[PDB]
């Protein structure tokens, strides 16, 4: 797991949706705090495989 | 079984016992112009743009009043703490940078003049480089440590010491570096990223400038403007000086801040931030990573204010409005504006640094803020969007050059030195003023259309050659530095240079504060906002050593 998913997830504004509306991955936009959804992070790291 | 333990040696390094070998020399060196462009941080640009919302000229910017906090509390004079994690960041960045260039100077003073000549010239690049970074520790922190013994060894650094120097004595050793790259530069530089001669006449200048404002007291104030000072500052700004190096005013003041454009005759020295080199993404300027506007996506910081853009109105003759300005906020339709203002602040209903296909406008595409701080956007750093210049990093960055001396400042500062040397040349310096007036009434290359397309005035003139009071001339020349200087985070400092920073602040404060909540409790306090905190964990690993600056204890 990628460092600190856990401490990302926990100081991300429950606003922010997993997915969008389209069914890709949800963000932040705006003035919301610039941060990424940690879920996606997860999907983007599936392969990084020692 | 001792041949056993002496096997292994260090991989992918060069000792400290090999560092000041000669095949190196120059390594040191390029080395040491490097951290300019790589030392710094998104919060702590050495452009110091983030200590310049303590100014009357910006705002912080982004999500909000939290987004930043050491930051907001610097913008309203309320809530600093010698403790905050971004004083002493700046500290220690700016001492790194005196590190590469005192390693430099320990390996270039063992070198044989017969084996290389450019010794000297190289010392110089380094002693100039040297007081580049104790200057602006100055401008931070005027009780500062002096380190321009590069023969030092690492332990003698526990004993050194910010009050070694009396103020007065400080601006001395960064003057004497300057001093020293005036004698021994080339007068042309054909790699543009070193200075010539003129460039160190001109930061010799502007430093007995700062030296110049004396604060010889106990405390922030002044005790007097000493002529011998000025004398140098008229000195080493000479146009002959000038002249020996190709340097001079551009055709449009646009050209200063644009890519298209890079060392060209104003740039008297400047940064040479890069892409396609090797590095892994840079060398691009990150430092302004924060300043790049929401349309990016991030982050809406250095913001300019109303104060600045009210600034640039001007009067049916062209001239500014020097007791009516910031009363109503600039009409487009209405009012005659400068052209500069087009240049330096990009407002909504107009084109985005100068791109027709993206215009400005007051919502969640411009304002991370929601209008918190308004909807203005500093363009002196950002581009083009569609700027093959422009990469995404951790943050967004450009290529573009950053200059620390542009030639505007050559004469702005020799006005000065004129107008308050009062021996009677006040009108040669109205004639420097002029010189920089005239250019941006005319610099009108990109926002030509504007006048039938957005409705824009322009008209600037200069002032007529007569004769004027020294407390007149001084209003003509500050007002000349800030609409020339906009953004460009020289602001702040000037005022602590003409000991007005407590008035001019204050009164900004409430002048601003019905138009950007934030600014409703601030207050500047007299003799001890004027610098900074020297930072506790400074003073605190010092065991002693380290005096804090008045008005801190
Ligand atoms: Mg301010
Ligand atoms: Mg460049």
Redesign the interface.
């Given at each position: 797991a990628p460092g600190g998913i856990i401490e990302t997830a926990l100081d991300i504004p429950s606003a922010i949706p997993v997915y969008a509306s389209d069914g890709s991955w949800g963000g932040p936009?705006?003035?919301?705090?610039?941060r990424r959804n940690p879920r996606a992070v997860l999907e983007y790291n599936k392969d990084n495989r020692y | 079984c001792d041949d056993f333990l002496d096997r292994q040696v260090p991989q992918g390094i060069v000792t400290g016992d090999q560092i000041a070998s000669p095949e190196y020399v120059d390594n040191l060196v390029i080395s040491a112009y490097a951290i300019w462009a790589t030392g710094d941080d998104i919060n702590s640009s050495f452009s110091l743009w983030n200590y310049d919302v303590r100014s009357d000229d910006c705002y912080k910017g982004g999500s909000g009043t939290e987004d930043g906090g050491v930051f907001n509390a610097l913008e309203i004079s309320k809530g600093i703490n010698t403790t905050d994690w971004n004083i002493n960041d700046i500290w220690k960045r700016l001492y790194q940078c005196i590190t590469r260039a005192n390693t430099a100077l320990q390996s270039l003073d063992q070198m044989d003049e017969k084996t290389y000549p450019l010794k000297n010239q190289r010392i110089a690049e380094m002693r100039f480089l040297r007081g580049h970074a104790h200057f602006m520790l100055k401008q931070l922190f005027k009780k500062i440590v002096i380190v321009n013994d590069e023969n030092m060894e690492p332990d003698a650094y526990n004993e050194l010491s910010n009050t070694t120097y009396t103020n007065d004595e400080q601006w001395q050793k960064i003057a004497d570096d300057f001093q020293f790259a005036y004698d021994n530069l080339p007068e042309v530089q054909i790699e543009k990223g070193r200075p010539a001669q003129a460039a160190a006449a001109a930061y010799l200048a502007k430093t007995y400038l700062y030296k110049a404002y004396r604060q010889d007291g106990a405390d922030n104030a002044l005790t007097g403007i000493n002529e011998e000072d000025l004398k140098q500052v008229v000195k080493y700004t000479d146009p002959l000086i000038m002249a020996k190096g190709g340097y001079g005013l551009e055709t449009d003041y646009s050209m200063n801040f644009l890519p298209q454009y890079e060392n060209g005759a104003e740039s008297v020295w400047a940064i040479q931030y890069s892409i396609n080199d090797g590095t892994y993404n840079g060398n691009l300027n990150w430092g302004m990573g924060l300043t790049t506007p929401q349309i990016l996506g991030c982050c809406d910081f250095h913001k300019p204010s109303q104060n600045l853009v009210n600034a640039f109105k001007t009067d049916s003759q062209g001239k500014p409005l020097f007791s009516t300005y910031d009363n109503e906020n600039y009409e487009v339709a209405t009012d005659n504006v400068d052209p500069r203002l087009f240049h330096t602040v990009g407002m909504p209903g107009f084109p985005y640094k100068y791109n027709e296909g993206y215009i400005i406008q007051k919502n969640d595409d411009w304002s991370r803020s929601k209008g918190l701080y308004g909807y203005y956007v500093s363009l002196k750093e950002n581009v083009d969007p569609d700027c093959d210049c422009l990469k995404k990093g951790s943050y967004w960055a450009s290529s573009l050059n950053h200059i620390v001396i542009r030639y505007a400042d050559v004469l702005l500062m020799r006005a000065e030195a004129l107008i308050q040397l009062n021996d009677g040349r006040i009108t040669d310096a109205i004639s420097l003023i002029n010189e920089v007036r005239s250019r941006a009434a005319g610099s009108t290359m990109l926002i030509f259309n504007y006048k039938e397309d957005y409705g824009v005035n322009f008209k600037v003139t200069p002032y007529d050659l007569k004769a004027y009071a020294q407390d007149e001339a001084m209003k003509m020349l500050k007002w000349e530095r800030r609409v020339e200087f906009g953004m460009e985070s020289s602001r702040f400092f000037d005022l602590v240079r003409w000991g007005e920073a407590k008035d001019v602040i204050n009164a900004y404060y409430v002048t601003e504060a019905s138009r950007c909540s934030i600014y409703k409790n601030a207050g500047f306090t007299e003799n001890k906002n004027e610098y900074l905190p020297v930072p506790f964990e400074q003073i605190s690993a010092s065991n002693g050593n380290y005096t804090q600056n008045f008005g801190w204890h």
């Open positions: 936009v705006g003035g919301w705090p610039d | -």
